[PDB]
Amino acid sequence: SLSSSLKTCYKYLNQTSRSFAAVIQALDGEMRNAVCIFYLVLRALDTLEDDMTISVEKKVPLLHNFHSFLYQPDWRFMESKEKDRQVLEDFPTISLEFRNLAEKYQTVIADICRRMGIGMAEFLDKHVTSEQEWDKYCHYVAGLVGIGLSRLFSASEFEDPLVGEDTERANSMGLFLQKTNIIRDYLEDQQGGREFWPQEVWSRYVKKLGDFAKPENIDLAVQCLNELITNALHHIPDVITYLSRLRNQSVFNFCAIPQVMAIATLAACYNNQQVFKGAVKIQAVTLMMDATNMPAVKAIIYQYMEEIYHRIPDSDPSSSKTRQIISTIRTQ
Ligand SMILES: CC(C)=CCC/C(C)=C/CC/C(C)=C/[C@@H]1[C@@H](COP(=O)(O)OP(=O)(O)O)[C@]1(C)CC/C=C(\C)CCC=C(C)C
Ligand SMILES: [Mg+2]
Ligand SMILES: [Mg+2]
């Protein structure tokens, strides 16, 4: 049945994706290969972005031109020192399967890969400063993913045109996952020399972002944490809107399950000193089972919002804001 190279792609998906492998492979019809290949192309792109052994001067053209390599049958990259580097070394297998997809899917994937490459390259010579720049960075690495997935759903015709048209809601869906991961991964990122928390926020608490790892700064660290979580909560209305429009069951699950995992993650991290001591974990199997329709997804969201709500310290500088956003979400 499945070709040799396509079988390899699914192996690469299963090897490199904890959050998405299962939901991708459960997608109906043409969406399955289209989303699997989209995933692997972006995974390869990210593996170059993240590799600190590649100079900025070498990295910029690679990220800028990456979308064109999809059309060059023996393009590969042998100099990665990153863990996921099979997708780069065996890129010809991935690009072959890309060129086997229908044109309408090719167009979306290449457009997103082009735009993300430009965006990633832009942020090689700066850190994230303002909250606005934080949205911008998150747009480039995650918002564009949501926009691309939405365009693939509409192109497949399992979903209505509106899904791919409403780039604001698609963008928000991606932003919610990416802000959640960035918040949760403070320490692991710190330990690999990576900084993604917005400097206009953290610099109101400490002089260097790394200072949140020091035990004496825990109180300030948690305050900043709660500010950032409060920011991320503002994406939940759009997530609800986006999910409420989906018709196909496999698409709904693919979209909803990672969103509810992110909500559960934020709730676990809220006011939690452990974020600064290791990776905070969530329920996964349960949520995978329950998050298969809108009324159940809404109920899951409201349950986690009430968990956060009744944990808000009155003294937290963001407490008013956290209460307000939770109220809005509860009222949609
Ligand atoms: C094409 C597909 C599913 C994903 C492509 C993922 C890739 C490789 C992107 C290259 C840049 C990166 C890395 C972005 C970060 C992804 C987490 O990876 P990871 O940390 O490895 O997870 P785990 O370790 O838990 O497995 C991220 C947070 C963005 C997720 C945003 C989505 C999915 C939009 C949802 C929106 C709608 C559905 C409207
Ligand atoms: Mg990465
Ligand atoms: Mg990266």
Side-chain angles (χ1 to χ4, degrees):
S1 214
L2 247 42
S3 80
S4 193
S5 50
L6 192 49
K7 184 169 188 267
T8 304
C9 288
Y10 282 98
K11 198 180 82 196
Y12 294 161
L13 170 76
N14 289 110
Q15 291 177 337
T16 61
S17 189
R18 282 303 112 88
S19 291
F20 303 105
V23 293
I24 288 177
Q25 285 170 293
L27 289 166
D28 285 344
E30 284 174 357
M31 293 182 298
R32 196 185 296 183
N33 297 342
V35 177
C36 174
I37 295 313
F38 190 29
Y39 170 85
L40 294 167
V41 160
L42 296 189
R43 179 51 77 200
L45 181 65
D46 186 59
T47 309
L48 291 170
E49 190 222 23
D50 290 353
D51 194 337
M52 297 316 292
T53 67
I54 305 180
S55 70
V56 170
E57 94 168 316
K58 278 197 71 216
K59 194 174 290 185
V60 168
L62 289 172
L63 299 177
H64 273 189
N65 294 129
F66 197 85
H67 66 104
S68 68
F69 303 154
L70 297 160
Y71 296 95
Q72 192 182 335
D74 52 29
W75 188 86
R76 72 182 78 251
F77 188 81
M78 296 311 295
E79 284 115 86
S80 181
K81 264 68 186 165
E82 291 296 298
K83 130 168 269 288
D84 299 330
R85 71 167 193 286
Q86 65 268 35
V87 298
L88 286 167
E89 300 193 347
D90 195 21
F91 200 71
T93 296
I94 295 168
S95 73
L96 167 57
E97 289 305 325
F98 168 88
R99 300 182 306 272
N100 289 339
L101 300 173
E103 183 251 87
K104 62 190 184 177
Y105 306 127
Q106 287 182 198
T107 307
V108 179
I109 294 163
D111 178 64
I112 301 298
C113 182
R114 182 177 61 71
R115 290 165 67 185
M116 183 179 308
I118 291 167
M120 283 171 163
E122 178 190 322
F123 273 86
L124 301 175
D125 74 2
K126 52 180 179 169
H127 296 279
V128 174
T129 58
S130 69
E131 275 170 301
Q132 190 184 335
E133 287 277 303
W134 201 33
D135 289 346
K136 194 180 196 200
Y137 177 73
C138 289
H139 169 71
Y140 286 143
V141 302
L144 286 174
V145 184
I147 288 160
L149 290 161
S150 304
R151 290 163 65 195
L152 294 177
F153 305 148
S154 290
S156 79
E157 304 187 82
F158 286 105
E159 302 298 330
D160 291 328
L162 179 46
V163 176
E165 277 159 11
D166 190 344
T167 58
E168 173 189 11
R169 274 46 180 268
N171 187 58
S172 293
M173 285 274 290
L175 263 54
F176 187 64
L177 300 186
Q178 184 63 264
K179 288 182 178 178
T180 298
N181 282 9
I182 279 164
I183 290 162
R184 182 247 276 121
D185 295 337
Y186 166 82
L187 188 64
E188 173 184 277
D189 280 334
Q190 201 56 43
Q191 289 168 348
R194 285 144 68 87
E195 303 209 318
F196 300 105
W197 285 26
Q199 177 205 263
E200 292 198 356
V201 176
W202 66 248
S203 68
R204 288 189 266 104
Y205 303 90
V206 290
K207 291 186 177 73
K208 303 178 299 309
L209 179 58
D211 294 348
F212 292 150
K214 304 178 180 176
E216 65 270 28
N217 290 331
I218 191 56
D219 282 351
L220 288 161
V222 172
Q223 281 179 356
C224 188
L225 167 68
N226 295 341
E227 193 176 344
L228 294 181
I229 288 170
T230 303
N231 176 307
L233 296 177
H234 284 69
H235 301 300
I236 290 168
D238 275 359
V239 168
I240 289 169
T241 301
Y242 183 97
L243 292 176
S244 76
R245 294 167 170 173
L246 302 172
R247 287 186 183 281
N248 179 92
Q249 184 70 64
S250 79
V251 171
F252 184 92
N253 298 342
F254 164 85
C255 293
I257 285 158
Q259 304 289 331
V260 300
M261 298 288 176
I263 287 154
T265 300
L266 285 189
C269 288
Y270 183 76
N271 213 37
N272 190 348
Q273 302 195 330
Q274 296 302 310
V275 171
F276 300 99
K277 312 185 183 280
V280 169
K281 310 288 188 186
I282 48 252
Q283 278 285 118
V285 284
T286 289
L287 288 169
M288 278 169 52
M289 293 174 71
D290 287 2
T292 60
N293 61 72
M294 258 332 275
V297 163
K298 278 184 173 164
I300 281 159
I301 295 170
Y302 305 149
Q303 179 220 308
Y304 286 117
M305 288 317 96
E306 194 78 351
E307 279 180 34
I308 296 169
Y309 194 84
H310 293 278
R311 265 156 64 199
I312 300 178
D314 251 324
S315 42
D316 189 86
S318 314
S319 52
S320 195
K321 274 285 288 181
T322 319
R323 296 186 189 113
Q324 184 195 51
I325 191 54
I326 288 169
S327 299
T328 303
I329 296 166
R330 199 51 186 91
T331 313
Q332 271 221 303

